[PDB]
Nucleic acid binder design. Sequence first.
RNA 1: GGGCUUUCGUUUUCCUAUAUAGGAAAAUGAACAGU
Lengths: 350, 467
Amino acid sequence: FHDQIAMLSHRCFNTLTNSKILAAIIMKKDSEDMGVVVSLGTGNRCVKGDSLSLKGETVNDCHAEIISRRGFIRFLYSELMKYNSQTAKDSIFEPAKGGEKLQIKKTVSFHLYISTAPCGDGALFDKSCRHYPVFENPKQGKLRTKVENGEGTIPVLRTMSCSDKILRWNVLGLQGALLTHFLQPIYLKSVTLGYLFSQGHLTRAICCRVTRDGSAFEDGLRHPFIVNHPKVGRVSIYDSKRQSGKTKETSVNWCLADGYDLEILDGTRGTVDGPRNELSRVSKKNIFLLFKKLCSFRYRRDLLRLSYGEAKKAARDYETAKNYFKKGLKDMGYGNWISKPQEEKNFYLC
Amino acid sequence: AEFKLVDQSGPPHEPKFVYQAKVGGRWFPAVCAHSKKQGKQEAADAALRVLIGENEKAERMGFTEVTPVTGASLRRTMLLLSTFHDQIAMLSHRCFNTLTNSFQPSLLGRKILAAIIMKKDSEDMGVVVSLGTGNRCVKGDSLSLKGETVNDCHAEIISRRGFIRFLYSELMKYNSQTAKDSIFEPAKGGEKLQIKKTVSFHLYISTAPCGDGALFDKSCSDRAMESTESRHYPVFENPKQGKLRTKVENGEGTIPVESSDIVPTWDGIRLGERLRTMSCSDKILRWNVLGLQGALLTHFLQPIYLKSVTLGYLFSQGHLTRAICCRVTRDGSAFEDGLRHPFIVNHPKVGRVSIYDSKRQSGKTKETSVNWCLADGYDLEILDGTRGTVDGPRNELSRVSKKNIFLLFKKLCSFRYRRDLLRLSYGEAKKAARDYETAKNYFKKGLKDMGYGNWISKPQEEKNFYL
RNA sequence: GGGCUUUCGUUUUCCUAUAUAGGAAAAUGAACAGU
Ligand SMILES: O=P(O)(O)O[C@H]1[C@H](OP(=O)(O)O)[C@H](OP(=O)(O)O)[C@H](OP(=O)(O)O)[C@@H](OP(=O)(O)O)[C@H]1OP(=O)(O)O
Ligand SMILES: O=P(O)(O)O[C@H]1[C@H](OP(=O)(O)O)[C@H](OP(=O)(O)O)[C@H](OP(=O)(O)O)[C@@H](OP(=O)(O)O)[C@H]1OP(=O)(O)O
Ligand SMILES: [Zn+2]
Ligand SMILES: [Zn+2]
Ligand SMILES: [Zn+2]
Ligand SMILES: [Zn+2]
């Protein structure tokens, strides 16, 4: 099953780059349907403190998985743009309970593919080493933050590892805070790894780290948020020799609604590669514009007056679930999750 | 090069294979053979007979990444490619030959040999107390999270590890009755032992130590002089000399610690960055400034220092002296007063064997490593230097690994009624010794401030392991 | 490079039945993946 996902992602990337560390998100309409790559990203770098922007014109994590999630968010915004009464049947969204929000249809699902393991708790194992998590040591399961000048992470202006962010996705959904105003949380059906695949430490890292001490965490999670446990798999055949070849710090991102226009960023700073220093299309400003256009189209003038921070905090359910998940992580002995100062998100669109 | 399986035929119990060697665009005689291995051997053989002289076949594709760059270093590399010390060398090589007199023929390849010799008094002939070989290191993939691998296999490093094992055994043998016969004596206050003033240690390396001790052609070989004076003569011809340097993984040469701010991390190295192990010359400098006993042993002993270094090839006084001990004294003696007794710099007598053995082949350097300690008797440990484990299908634990050293430390702490140390982890136990940690941190800070770079340390998840 | 851990396929031997096919022990030659 994962071989088709990997080959689809590789073929899509090769076709788009005809004119590596590569992640993609793939939406499969039905089981018989092969599936289509919907979001694509590459990169291995993260910005430093000097590239941090208060107004949010720089992406603070050019890693492959994060940028693929950003592309998927843009794609979801596009699909919400395309939704109407006439095209309701042919779309992937259906009315949810209460009629206040839309929701993803049951048949359509999403899957994730990463060429290598996420940084953090996903590659803490040696050659010696239903979900089957592994908790043989006290140090296992701790949060780790990305280090500058490298792909690695160190245990706890600091950006959590890819594994911790995948856990946050598996608990609070993929759509983020803003799309909660118009959607129910969406969870990955499967996670596929190309290299550095351990069953015990990947399932512990992404889903099961909050189920070590029993089911005392799920009961306190208000609906519809759930502790998703996506199916975890690996590609059948793999290149033997680990690849140590030097890797450029350019990051390529693409979404299904962009046709054949890739965007290139440099992870050291987080802007489009060019002398003019163009604003990235996966930046906070573009996402806020896209949401404010969705809100204008949906006649929800209430959310227009709210800034990025106010609109993000407007989703009471999502923010409560986020705070509860953070507190549950801090309780079990994993260290405090770091959040950037609110002045970064306190920007008003011009 | 390519070995093409032209054809396979015959029944499974007696197949016939037909192989052909190809180099670039030149094809060679096709051969019949009984096994694939012998197919390749005979194909190669035929190609060689055709072109031992043409050499067309020889040029294509080396596998690991390359870069000897210090400054215009390519010409330098091409030029490079093209007590009475003799007693130390004879003792070391006789001990090696006696140990491996009738073992497997796999130890007939080229090797680098290092040994540590102890002399109990003036008329002592000399006895080998350690032995190590090898020329390789581990990869970034083969690291371990519980200390089951050796991060290096250079001859001097394995020799020092064997010396550590010998020190542990000799501390085991010590007691109140046999204090006189033991090499140790009580220090001021009796808290920690110390080495007897009549006992000395010497180190012999079959070649020059990698790093700052080998940036000169073999044609720069100074002649052996029995100079009575012990005063060194370092030479600082260029700023580039004195820089620290690491043996990078899958790379050739010995490259300085650059403006490469890549922070060594466990998952980062696993994901595919380059693993940099420090050169042997830097390690020998660290021994001369801190001691050969490491950090754990300093609980029960004062630092143990060396007295002489004997090299069997590529000796240059002005280079080696700066490589091992003089590079920390270039800018005055202000570094010496910063260090705290019993930690002090050591200036061992440098020496060269009377005549080098001219047969020093450059290619065909295998990866096998050999270890031997005094307590072991006739038992030698053979390791595969690429993986850092015992060479064999079972890849069992190496007796010089961090885990076995920790086990010996626990045994000695139990024997010496040191209950407080018995409940600490490896990293905390090393950090328990305040004096050694302070001296090491000060020495690294002095190296960085004075202008030779920054020391490269393994990921914290690898030094502080789980037991 | 080495090295432990399903086959294909030889003889001998044992058995079934009618020299024959089948089953079985042994080793014999290549591939093979965990270390
Ligand atoms: O860009 P992402 O990595 O996908 O996540 C960012 C951001 O994380 P980074 O700053 O590391 O990029 C926020 O985490 P913080 O570091 O700011 O704490 C996080 O959550 P918050 O915005 O609530 O802090 C999230 O937001 P969401 O919960 O909607 O997934 C999202 O923020 P943006 O998409 O607005 O940049
Ligand atoms: O090569 P070795 O002679 O075995 O030195 C190793 C190790 O070096 P490796 O990098 O090759 O593993 C450590 O060096 P770093 O990792 O820090 O670069 C260092 O450990 P410390 O710096 O923490 O002291 C040292 O320690 P010591 O001076 O006590 O001998 C010792 O470590 P082990 O004895 O545990 O092997
Ligand atoms: Zn990452
Ligand atoms: Zn799980
Ligand atoms: Zn060396
Ligand atoms: Zn000196």
